[PDB]
Amino acid sequence: FERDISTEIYQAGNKPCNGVAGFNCYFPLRSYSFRPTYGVGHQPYRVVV
Amino acid sequence: STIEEQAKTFLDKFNHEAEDLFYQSSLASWNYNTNITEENVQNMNNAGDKWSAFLKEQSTLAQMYPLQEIQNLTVKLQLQALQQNGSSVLSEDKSKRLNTILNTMSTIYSTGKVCNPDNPQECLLLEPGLNEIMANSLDYNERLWAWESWRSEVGKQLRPLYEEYVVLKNEMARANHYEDYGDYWRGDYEVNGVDGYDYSRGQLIEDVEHTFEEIKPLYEHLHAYVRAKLMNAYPSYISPIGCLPAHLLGDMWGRFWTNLYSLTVPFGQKPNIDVTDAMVDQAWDAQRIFKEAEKFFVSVGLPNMTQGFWENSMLTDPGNVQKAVCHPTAWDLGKGDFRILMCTKVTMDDFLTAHHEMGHIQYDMAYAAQPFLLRNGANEGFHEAVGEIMSLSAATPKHLKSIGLLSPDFQEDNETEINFLLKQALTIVGTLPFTYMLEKWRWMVFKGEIPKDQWMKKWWEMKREIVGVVEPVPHDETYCDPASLFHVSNDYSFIRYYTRTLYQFQFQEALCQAAKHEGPLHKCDISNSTEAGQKLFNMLRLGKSEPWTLALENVVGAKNMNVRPLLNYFEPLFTWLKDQNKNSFVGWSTDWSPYA
Ligand SMILES: *[C@@H]1O[C@H](CO)[C@@H](O[C@@H]2O[C@H](CO)[C@@H](O)[C@H](O)[C@H]2NC(C)=O)[C@H](O)[C@H]1NC(C)=O
Ligand SMILES: *[C@@H]1O[C@H](CO)[C@@H](O)[C@H](O)[C@H]1NC(C)=O
Ligand SMILES: *[C@@H]1O[C@H](CO)[C@@H](O)[C@H](O)[C@H]1NC(C)=O
Ligand SMILES: *[C@@H]1O[C@H](CO)[C@@H](O)[C@H](O)[C@H]1NC(C)=O
Ligand SMILES: *[C@@H]1O[C@H](CO)[C@@H](O)[C@H](O)[C@H]1NC(C)=O
Ligand SMILES: *[C@@H]1O[C@H](CO)[C@@H](O)[C@H](O)[C@H]1NC(C)=O
Ligand SMILES: [Zn+2]
């Protein structure tokens, strides 16, 4: 029952990320990039709980 | 934060981006393949350039991980396939000269033009003229002229390019810590880090030599039979114990012996089983053929298949204005997208070919959950060693009678079995020594054991020994006969076909034992054998996460190449070849030549 909206880049290494994309510092957000030709198990699904 | 954790964190994003990027590249290529237009050329080129740039950038980023500090035997496998420094170790000039060499080789091979004598106007390419002449024409003069022209006008155009290619490939192999480029090709089968299942590149040569030696007795009987049959057609062209001429092998290079079936048939009054007229009679179409194939596939327990395959992929020739390639292609775009292209015509050849591709995509969808870098077969032989065997099993008379294409009134007589086995041997048995000696010659050239001045001088003994073929006209080192092949000009390994041929028969023993089939091995049907379907799927689903040795153990229970199934397939045939060869010399001599 928690929601994360912060886009702070995760630090996978020891050196600080310094707010620049590079080694061991990747942007935590990724896009679905849906296409109509996707498979049955990869198509979008509208989920309500 | 361990190094393995960092590698996993990098690889997750790498796989996630690479899947989408390769999907885009694959759709761009498929659009051009199904629709040849000017815009599609640019789209495909841009997609390929973007994919190459992304792969190079990711490899440069991942070069910082030393391979020694990754455990779990899974992340390290992806890093090995990702690093792949290859020719990028050398300077940019040596990379662009390699690109130029490959481009010129491909262009020269593609532009192969032969002009008829006394008329410098009617010239012919490899197809459809030269191919038809090599496949059907039996005239000695025309075949010899075409063979000489093709090996003369093309060999010299690539011989210095071949020398430079060999030298620079040796340099690249040295820079990549390899003994030779042959080891660079053989590195696919290498297995390390697994106790009791390690594999080495050098052991492969001995393994293939032993199986070639054990195959040998099956080969010279067929060769003697073919020579005896050809003696009735060319009474003044073949020595009784000499080698067969190079351009009387059924085609231009002698790779396949199936072109002489119309002449080397022991029983010409017994037609083979061809039910193309049957499917013509019942108005069978492409949809009906695909439905019959699906009915065959569901009988072994394989799951259902998505509707997107039917909706997206085209399965009928459009003709008219829309020009598209008709080459049978199975596109695995990824992300649950699977497509197959065919220009389906009313012929049993297409029916047999579709068995390759449908099981091919069945294998492709098996390893969907695997990482993108591991969405391939454990080796280069596991990809469709089963896809070919289902096609071979689909030709059994039992299933042909079951589907209604063959009437039940077809009584089985042993005359048909011998003809079918001989026809199969004209495609599979005959090509094995030729492929082996070609691979050995290329390996020796890459290693350097064959001197520069004697590439062809050493080339013609194997022809006189391994395959029993003698040239009709002597050639010096100026000519380059091997350069006239598809694979040599495109820098492809030629052992893949031999390994796949070895692998396909090995699976058949286990498949028929699980199916509890009784009788000849070539009449074995895997229909209604869902246990065998589960057994094969258990190996198809592993993908690339496991070494090929483990997958080979999971089907037959071995760790080395096995040739006993090869003899089991042709066991009745070999005994009969022991009969009609009792009055003819079995073998050939290396001293006589047609040109004397
Ligand atoms: C596999 O099993 C199916 C059904 O279990 C077989 O299909 C039937 O075959 C019989 C004769 O073999 C026909 O009379 C029926 O019309 C077929 N269809 C049915 C019952 O729906 C099929 O022949 C079997 N295949 C093999 C190779 O044994
Ligand atoms: C093939 O491409 C041409 C032009 O790019 C287009 O006009 C045509 O509609 C395409 N074919 C199909 C089936 O969409
Ligand atoms: C290898 O890594 C996977 C994560 O992808 C993990 O589930 C598995 O347990 C690891 N292997 C071993 C032997 O711990
Ligand atoms: C090529 O890549 C390998 C793979 O890690 C690396 O060990 C080697 O140092 C690289 N060589 C050059 C010249 O970049
Ligand atoms: C899907 O597979 C089942 C076997 O589990 C089979 O009975 C059914 O006919 C298949 N569906 C189609 C449309 O082929
Ligand atoms: C088929 O079998 C019969 C009896 O076993 C035999 O006489 C005949 O020669 C066989 N056919 C061939 C082609 O050998
Ligand atoms: Zn294939």
PDB file of C-alpha atoms in Angstrom, chain B residues 167-400:
ATOM      1  CA  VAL B 167      46.357 -13.341 -43.611  1.00  0.00           C
ATOM      2  CA  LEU B 168      44.189 -10.754 -41.864  1.00  0.00           C
ATOM      3  CA  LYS B 169      41.963 -13.422 -40.295  1.00  0.00           C
ATOM      4  CA  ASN B 170      45.100 -15.085 -38.928  1.00  0.00           C
ATOM      5  CA  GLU B 171      46.205 -11.702 -37.568  1.00  0.00           C
ATOM      6  CA  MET B 172      42.791 -11.148 -35.958  1.00  0.00           C
ATOM      7  CA  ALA B 173      42.839 -14.632 -34.415  1.00  0.00           C
ATOM      8  CA  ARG B 174      46.299 -13.923 -33.001  1.00  0.00           C
ATOM      9  CA  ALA B 175      45.029 -10.608 -31.611  1.00  0.00           C
ATOM     10  CA  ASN B 176      42.031 -12.411 -30.057  1.00  0.00           C
ATOM     11  CA  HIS B 177      44.235 -15.088 -28.414  1.00  0.00           C
ATOM     12  CA  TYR B 178      43.413 -17.905 -30.839  1.00  0.00           C
ATOM     13  CA  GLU B 179      45.654 -20.404 -32.604  1.00  0.00           C
ATOM     14  CA  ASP B 180      43.919 -19.824 -35.953  1.00  0.00           C
ATOM     15  CA  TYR B 181      40.634 -18.737 -37.516  1.00  0.00           C
ATOM     16  CA  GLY B 182      39.567 -22.386 -37.566  1.00  0.00           C
ATOM     17  CA  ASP B 183      39.613 -22.319 -33.774  1.00  0.00           C
ATOM     18  CA  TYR B 184      37.708 -19.029 -34.000  1.00  0.00           C
ATOM     19  CA  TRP B 185      34.943 -20.906 -35.826  1.00  0.00           C
ATOM     20  CA  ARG B 186      35.185 -23.969 -33.545  1.00  0.00           C
ATOM     21  CA  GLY B 187      34.847 -21.872 -30.370  1.00  0.00           C
ATOM     22  CA  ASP B 188      31.056 -22.289 -30.490  1.00  0.00           C
ATOM     23  CA  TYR B 189      31.215 -25.829 -29.078  1.00  0.00           C
ATOM     24  CA  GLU B 190      33.744 -24.997 -26.342  1.00  0.00           C
ATOM     25  CA  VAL B 191      32.424 -25.653 -22.825  1.00  0.00           C
ATOM     26  CA  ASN B 192      34.286 -24.564 -19.690  1.00  0.00           C
ATOM     27  CA  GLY B 193      33.592 -24.223 -15.981  1.00  0.00           C
ATOM     28  CA  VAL B 194      31.418 -27.357 -15.695  1.00  0.00           C
ATOM     29  CA  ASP B 195      32.852 -30.372 -13.887  1.00  0.00           C
ATOM     30  CA  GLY B 196      32.755 -33.538 -15.972  1.00  0.00           C
ATOM     31  CA  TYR B 197      31.443 -31.769 -19.081  1.00  0.00           C
ATOM     32  CA  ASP B 198      34.275 -29.490 -20.258  1.00  0.00           C
ATOM     33  CA  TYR B 199      34.901 -29.289 -24.002  1.00  0.00           C
ATOM     34  CA  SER B 200      37.928 -28.182 -26.013  1.00  0.00           C
ATOM     35  CA  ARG B 201      38.295 -26.932 -29.575  1.00  0.00           C
ATOM     36  CA  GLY B 202      41.100 -29.381 -30.384  1.00  0.00           C
ATOM     37  CA  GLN B 203      39.064 -32.432 -29.345  1.00  0.00           C
ATOM     38  CA  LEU B 204      36.464 -31.612 -32.019  1.00  0.00           C
ATOM     39  CA  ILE B 205      38.915 -32.452 -34.815  1.00  0.00           C
ATOM     40  CA  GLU B 206      39.577 -35.905 -33.360  1.00  0.00           C
ATOM     41  CA  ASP B 207      35.866 -36.443 -32.687  1.00  0.00           C
ATOM     42  CA  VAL B 208      34.913 -35.668 -36.290  1.00  0.00           C
ATOM     43  CA  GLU B 209      37.859 -37.689 -37.646  1.00  0.00           C
ATOM     44  CA  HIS B 210      36.745 -40.789 -35.733  1.00  0.00           C
ATOM     45  CA  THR B 211      33.150 -40.499 -36.933  1.00  0.00           C
ATOM     46  CA  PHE B 212      34.328 -39.894 -40.511  1.00  0.00           C
ATOM     47  CA  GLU B 213      36.473 -43.032 -40.316  1.00  0.00           C
ATOM     48  CA  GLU B 214      33.527 -45.039 -38.978  1.00  0.00           C
ATOM     49  CA  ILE B 215      31.199 -43.607 -41.654  1.00  0.00           C
ATOM     50  CA  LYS B 216      33.743 -44.375 -44.443  1.00  0.00           C
ATOM     51  CA  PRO B 217      32.628 -47.983 -45.187  1.00  0.00           C
ATOM     52  CA  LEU B 218      29.102 -46.714 -45.878  1.00  0.00           C
ATOM     53  CA  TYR B 219      30.417 -44.146 -48.370  1.00  0.00           C
ATOM     54  CA  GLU B 220      32.603 -46.076 -50.818  1.00  0.00           C
ATOM     55  CA  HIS B 221      29.854 -48.654 -51.415  1.00  0.00           C
ATOM     56  CA  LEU B 222      27.509 -45.866 -52.529  1.00  0.00           C
ATOM     57  CA  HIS B 223      30.290 -44.298 -54.600  1.00  0.00           C
ATOM     58  CA  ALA B 224      31.034 -47.606 -56.349  1.00  0.00           C
ATOM     59  CA  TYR B 225      27.327 -48.119 -57.044  1.00  0.00           C
ATOM     60  CA  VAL B 226      27.058 -44.598 -58.488  1.00  0.00           C
ATOM     61  CA  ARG B 227      30.131 -45.180 -60.661  1.00  0.00           C
ATOM     62  CA  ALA B 228      28.747 -48.503 -61.913  1.00  0.00           C
ATOM     63  CA  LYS B 229      25.434 -46.848 -62.796  1.00  0.00           C
ATOM     64  CA  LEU B 230      27.225 -43.967 -64.547  1.00  0.00           C
ATOM     65  CA  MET B 231      29.259 -46.501 -66.542  1.00  0.00           C
ATOM     66  CA  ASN B 232      26.065 -47.280 -68.483  1.00  0.00           C
ATOM     67  CA  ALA B 233      25.656 -43.593 -69.433  1.00  0.00           C
ATOM     68  CA  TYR B 234      29.275 -42.487 -70.054  1.00  0.00           C
ATOM     69  CA  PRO B 235      31.099 -45.626 -71.253  1.00  0.00           C
ATOM     70  CA  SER B 236      34.177 -43.656 -72.414  1.00  0.00           C
ATOM     71  CA  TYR B 237      34.538 -41.085 -69.623  1.00  0.00           C
ATOM     72  CA  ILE B 238      35.064 -42.946 -66.307  1.00  0.00           C
ATOM     73  CA  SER B 239      37.996 -45.219 -65.535  1.00  0.00           C
ATOM     74  CA  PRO B 240      36.922 -48.581 -64.050  1.00  0.00           C
ATOM     75  CA  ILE B 241      38.912 -47.865 -60.862  1.00  0.00           C
ATOM     76  CA  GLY B 242      39.599 -44.143 -61.346  1.00  0.00           C
ATOM     77  CA  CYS B 243      37.920 -41.232 -59.614  1.00  0.00           C
ATOM     78  CA  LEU B 244      34.753 -39.677 -60.989  1.00  0.00           C
ATOM     79  CA  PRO B 245      35.107 -36.466 -63.044  1.00  0.00           C
ATOM     80  CA  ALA B 246      34.367 -33.223 -61.228  1.00  0.00           C
ATOM     81  CA  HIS B 247      31.563 -31.997 -63.517  1.00  0.00           C
ATOM     82  CA  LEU B 248      29.786 -35.383 -63.712  1.00  0.00           C
ATOM     83  CA  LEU B 249      28.937 -35.330 -59.989  1.00  0.00           C
ATOM     84  CA  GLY B 250      25.358 -34.154 -60.597  1.00  0.00           C
ATOM     85  CA  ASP B 251      26.059 -30.435 -60.110  1.00  0.00           C
ATOM     86  CA  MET B 252      28.868 -27.884 -60.227  1.00  0.00           C
ATOM     87  CA  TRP B 253      30.638 -28.746 -56.944  1.00  0.00           C
ATOM     88  CA  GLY B 254      29.434 -32.289 -56.255  1.00  0.00           C
ATOM     89  CA  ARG B 255      28.053 -31.433 -52.816  1.00  0.00           C
ATOM     90  CA  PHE B 256      24.739 -33.252 -53.401  1.00  0.00           C
ATOM     91  CA  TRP B 257      24.353 -36.588 -55.193  1.00  0.00           C
ATOM     92  CA  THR B 258      20.548 -36.344 -55.446  1.00  0.00           C
ATOM     93  CA  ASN B 259      20.667 -34.954 -59.005  1.00  0.00           C
ATOM     94  CA  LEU B 260      21.567 -38.404 -60.403  1.00  0.00           C
ATOM     95  CA  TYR B 261      18.529 -40.214 -58.963  1.00  0.00           C
ATOM     96  CA  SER B 262      16.837 -40.249 -62.382  1.00  0.00           C
ATOM     97  CA  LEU B 263      19.843 -42.211 -63.706  1.00  0.00           C
ATOM     98  CA  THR B 264      21.086 -44.246 -60.705  1.00  0.00           C
ATOM     99  CA  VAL B 265      17.693 -45.772 -59.833  1.00  0.00           C
ATOM    100  CA  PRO B 266      17.788 -49.587 -59.469  1.00  0.00           C
ATOM    101  CA  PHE B 267      14.042 -49.960 -60.107  1.00  0.00           C
ATOM    102  CA  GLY B 268      12.764 -47.474 -62.678  1.00  0.00           C
ATOM    103  CA  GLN B 269       9.350 -49.151 -62.928  1.00  0.00           C
ATOM    104  CA  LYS B 270       8.370 -48.273 -59.332  1.00  0.00           C
ATOM    105  CA  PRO B 271       7.411 -44.595 -58.898  1.00  0.00           C
ATOM    106  CA  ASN B 272       8.070 -42.956 -55.553  1.00  0.00           C
ATOM    107  CA  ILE B 273       5.354 -41.849 -53.137  1.00  0.00           C
ATOM    108  CA  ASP B 274       4.190 -38.468 -54.472  1.00  0.00           C
ATOM    109  CA  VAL B 275       0.769 -37.251 -53.337  1.00  0.00           C
ATOM    110  CA  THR B 276       0.890 -33.791 -54.901  1.00  0.00           C
ATOM    111  CA  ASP B 277      -1.688 -34.930 -57.467  1.00  0.00           C
ATOM    112  CA  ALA B 278      -3.793 -36.116 -54.522  1.00  0.00           C
ATOM    113  CA  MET B 279      -3.809 -32.716 -52.816  1.00  0.00           C
ATOM    114  CA  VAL B 280      -4.520 -31.147 -56.207  1.00  0.00           C
ATOM    115  CA  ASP B 281      -7.512 -33.484 -56.571  1.00  0.00           C
ATOM    116  CA  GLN B 282      -9.031 -32.553 -53.193  1.00  0.00           C
ATOM    117  CA  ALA B 283      -8.424 -28.830 -53.910  1.00  0.00           C
ATOM    118  CA  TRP B 284      -5.955 -28.506 -51.045  1.00  0.00           C
ATOM    119  CA  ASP B 285      -4.768 -24.939 -50.448  1.00  0.00           C
ATOM    120  CA  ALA B 286      -2.150 -23.288 -48.250  1.00  0.00           C
ATOM    121  CA  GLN B 287      -4.635 -22.982 -45.380  1.00  0.00           C
ATOM    122  CA  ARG B 288      -5.471 -26.694 -45.571  1.00  0.00           C
ATOM    123  CA  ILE B 289      -1.769 -27.621 -45.599  1.00  0.00           C
ATOM    124  CA  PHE B 290      -1.130 -25.429 -42.553  1.00  0.00           C
ATOM    125  CA  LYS B 291      -4.139 -26.925 -40.751  1.00  0.00           C
ATOM    126  CA  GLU B 292      -2.866 -30.443 -41.478  1.00  0.00           C
ATOM    127  CA  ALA B 293       0.570 -29.464 -40.165  1.00  0.00           C
ATOM    128  CA  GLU B 294      -1.036 -28.046 -37.013  1.00  0.00           C
ATOM    129  CA  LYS B 295      -3.001 -31.279 -36.565  1.00  0.00           C
ATOM    130  CA  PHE B 296       0.255 -33.233 -36.875  1.00  0.00           C
ATOM    131  CA  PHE B 297       1.981 -30.956 -34.348  1.00  0.00           C
ATOM    132  CA  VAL B 298      -0.811 -31.048 -31.750  1.00  0.00           C
ATOM    133  CA  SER B 299      -0.630 -34.865 -31.734  1.00  0.00           C
ATOM    134  CA  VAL B 300       2.730 -34.773 -29.894  1.00  0.00           C
ATOM    135  CA  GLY B 301       1.552 -32.532 -27.047  1.00  0.00           C
ATOM    136  CA  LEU B 302       2.916 -29.193 -28.251  1.00  0.00           C
ATOM    137  CA  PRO B 303       0.904 -26.195 -26.981  1.00  0.00           C
ATOM    138  CA  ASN B 304      -1.322 -23.834 -28.952  1.00  0.00           C
ATOM    139  CA  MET B 305      -0.016 -20.898 -30.974  1.00  0.00           C
ATOM    140  CA  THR B 306      -1.032 -17.240 -30.913  1.00  0.00           C
ATOM    141  CA  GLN B 307      -3.451 -15.744 -33.439  1.00  0.00           C
ATOM    142  CA  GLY B 308      -0.906 -13.017 -34.228  1.00  0.00           C
ATOM    143  CA  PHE B 309       1.011 -15.566 -36.296  1.00  0.00           C
ATOM    144  CA  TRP B 310      -2.003 -15.999 -38.576  1.00  0.00           C
ATOM    145  CA  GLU B 311      -2.925 -12.306 -38.593  1.00  0.00           C
ATOM    146  CA  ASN B 312       0.490 -10.730 -39.220  1.00  0.00           C
ATOM    147  CA  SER B 313       2.571 -13.213 -41.215  1.00  0.00           C
ATOM    148  CA  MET B 314       1.770 -13.691 -44.896  1.00  0.00           C
ATOM    149  CA  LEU B 315       1.458 -17.250 -46.212  1.00  0.00           C
ATOM    150  CA  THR B 316       0.441 -16.776 -49.869  1.00  0.00           C
ATOM    151  CA  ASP B 317       2.275 -15.392 -52.882  1.00  0.00           C
ATOM    152  CA  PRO B 318       0.766 -11.983 -53.766  1.00  0.00           C
ATOM    153  CA  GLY B 319       2.062 -11.830 -57.331  1.00  0.00           C
ATOM    154  CA  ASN B 320       0.806  -8.939 -59.462  1.00  0.00           C
ATOM    155  CA  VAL B 321       2.772  -5.758 -58.722  1.00  0.00           C
ATOM    156  CA  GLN B 322       3.861  -6.350 -55.111  1.00  0.00           C
ATOM    157  CA  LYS B 323       7.282  -8.011 -55.370  1.00  0.00           C
ATOM    158  CA  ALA B 324       8.501  -9.863 -52.275  1.00  0.00           C
ATOM    159  CA  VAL B 325      11.126 -12.525 -51.663  1.00  0.00           C
ATOM    160  CA  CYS B 326       9.869 -16.115 -51.727  1.00  0.00           C
ATOM    161  CA  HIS B 327      12.665 -17.571 -49.589  1.00  0.00           C
ATOM    162  CA  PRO B 328      11.213 -19.623 -46.693  1.00  0.00           C
ATOM    163  CA  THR B 329      11.932 -17.478 -43.632  1.00  0.00           C
ATOM    164  CA  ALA B 330      10.938 -17.798 -39.978  1.00  0.00           C
ATOM    165  CA  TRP B 331      11.060 -14.411 -38.232  1.00  0.00           C
ATOM    166  CA  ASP B 332      11.235 -14.435 -34.425  1.00  0.00           C
ATOM    167  CA  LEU B 333      10.860 -10.716 -33.741  1.00  0.00           C
ATOM    168  CA  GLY B 334      10.599 -11.356 -30.000  1.00  0.00           C
ATOM    169  CA  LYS B 335       8.132 -10.049 -27.415  1.00  0.00           C
ATOM    170  CA  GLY B 336       5.607 -12.721 -28.346  1.00  0.00           C
ATOM    171  CA  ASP B 337       5.724 -12.007 -32.089  1.00  0.00           C
ATOM    172  CA  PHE B 338       6.319 -14.900 -34.494  1.00  0.00           C
ATOM    173  CA  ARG B 339       5.990 -14.817 -38.284  1.00  0.00           C
ATOM    174  CA  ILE B 340       6.628 -17.174 -41.205  1.00  0.00           C
ATOM    175  CA  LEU B 341       6.912 -16.320 -44.912  1.00  0.00           C
ATOM    176  CA  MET B 342       6.170 -18.727 -47.774  1.00  0.00           C
ATOM    177  CA  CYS B 343       5.115 -18.503 -51.413  1.00  0.00           C
ATOM    178  CA  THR B 344       3.007 -21.619 -51.034  1.00  0.00           C
ATOM    179  CA  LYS B 345       2.361 -23.479 -54.292  1.00  0.00           C
ATOM    180  CA  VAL B 346       0.587 -26.776 -54.937  1.00  0.00           C
ATOM    181  CA  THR B 347       3.511 -29.164 -54.411  1.00  0.00           C
ATOM    182  CA  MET B 348       4.487 -31.643 -51.703  1.00  0.00           C
ATOM    183  CA  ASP B 349       7.880 -29.911 -51.486  1.00  0.00           C
ATOM    184  CA  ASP B 350       6.233 -26.923 -49.791  1.00  0.00           C
ATOM    185  CA  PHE B 351       4.329 -29.308 -47.504  1.00  0.00           C
ATOM    186  CA  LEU B 352       7.609 -30.880 -46.376  1.00  0.00           C
ATOM    187  CA  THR B 353       9.320 -27.478 -46.094  1.00  0.00           C
ATOM    188  CA  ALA B 354       6.606 -26.052 -43.821  1.00  0.00           C
ATOM    189  CA  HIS B 355       7.426 -28.813 -41.327  1.00  0.00           C
ATOM    190  CA  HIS B 356      10.870 -27.246 -40.893  1.00  0.00           C
ATOM    191  CA  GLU B 357       9.546 -23.746 -40.274  1.00  0.00           C
ATOM    192  CA  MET B 358       6.578 -24.479 -38.000  1.00  0.00           C
ATOM    193  CA  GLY B 359       8.664 -26.633 -35.670  1.00  0.00           C
ATOM    194  CA  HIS B 360      11.408 -24.032 -36.106  1.00  0.00           C
ATOM    195  CA  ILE B 361       9.225 -21.308 -34.613  1.00  0.00           C
ATOM    196  CA  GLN B 362       8.017 -23.851 -32.039  1.00  0.00           C
ATOM    197  CA  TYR B 363      11.648 -24.120 -30.933  1.00  0.00           C
ATOM    198  CA  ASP B 364      11.991 -20.331 -31.108  1.00  0.00           C
ATOM    199  CA  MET B 365       9.073 -19.758 -28.725  1.00  0.00           C
ATOM    200  CA  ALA B 366      10.410 -22.384 -26.292  1.00  0.00           C
ATOM    201  CA  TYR B 367      13.147 -20.103 -24.903  1.00  0.00           C
ATOM    202  CA  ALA B 368      11.039 -16.936 -24.606  1.00  0.00           C
ATOM    203  CA  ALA B 369      11.700 -16.538 -20.861  1.00  0.00           C
ATOM    204  CA  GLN B 370      15.477 -16.726 -21.376  1.00  0.00           C
ATOM    205  CA  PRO B 371      17.600 -13.555 -21.493  1.00  0.00           C
ATOM    206  CA  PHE B 372      17.814 -11.985 -24.937  1.00  0.00           C
ATOM    207  CA  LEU B 373      21.519 -12.819 -25.232  1.00  0.00           C
ATOM    208  CA  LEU B 374      20.602 -16.478 -24.556  1.00  0.00           C
ATOM    209  CA  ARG B 375      17.651 -16.806 -26.966  1.00  0.00           C
ATOM    210  CA  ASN B 376      19.448 -19.283 -29.214  1.00  0.00           C
ATOM    211  CA  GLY B 377      20.355 -22.950 -29.294  1.00  0.00           C
ATOM    212  CA  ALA B 378      23.037 -24.291 -26.983  1.00  0.00           C
ATOM    213  CA  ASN B 379      25.128 -24.841 -30.120  1.00  0.00           C
ATOM    214  CA  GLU B 380      24.693 -24.314 -33.857  1.00  0.00           C
ATOM    215  CA  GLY B 381      23.228 -27.801 -34.336  1.00  0.00           C
ATOM    216  CA  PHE B 382      20.426 -27.728 -31.759  1.00  0.00           C
ATOM    217  CA  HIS B 383      18.477 -24.995 -33.562  1.00  0.00           C
ATOM    218  CA  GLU B 384      16.442 -27.243 -35.875  1.00  0.00           C
ATOM    219  CA  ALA B 385      17.993 -30.691 -35.536  1.00  0.00           C
ATOM    220  CA  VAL B 386      14.486 -31.593 -34.370  1.00  0.00           C
ATOM    221  CA  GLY B 387      12.776 -29.335 -36.915  1.00  0.00           C
ATOM    222  CA  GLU B 388      14.346 -31.356 -39.718  1.00  0.00           C
ATOM    223  CA  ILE B 389      13.555 -34.701 -38.077  1.00  0.00           C
ATOM    224  CA  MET B 390       9.814 -33.954 -37.865  1.00  0.00           C
ATOM    225  CA  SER B 391       9.879 -33.124 -41.581  1.00  0.00           C
ATOM    226  CA  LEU B 392      11.672 -36.409 -42.276  1.00  0.00           C
ATOM    227  CA  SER B 393       9.188 -38.352 -40.132  1.00  0.00           C
ATOM    228  CA  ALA B 394       6.260 -36.652 -41.883  1.00  0.00           C
ATOM    229  CA  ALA B 395       7.278 -38.427 -45.110  1.00  0.00           C
ATOM    230  CA  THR B 396       6.557 -41.869 -43.638  1.00  0.00           C
ATOM    231  CA  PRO B 397       3.847 -43.748 -45.591  1.00  0.00           C
ATOM    232  CA  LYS B 398       1.837 -44.409 -42.410  1.00  0.00           C
ATOM    233  CA  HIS B 399       1.067 -40.749 -41.708  1.00  0.00           C
ATOM    234  CA  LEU B 400       0.556 -40.086 -45.425  1.00  0.00           C
TER     235      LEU B 400
END
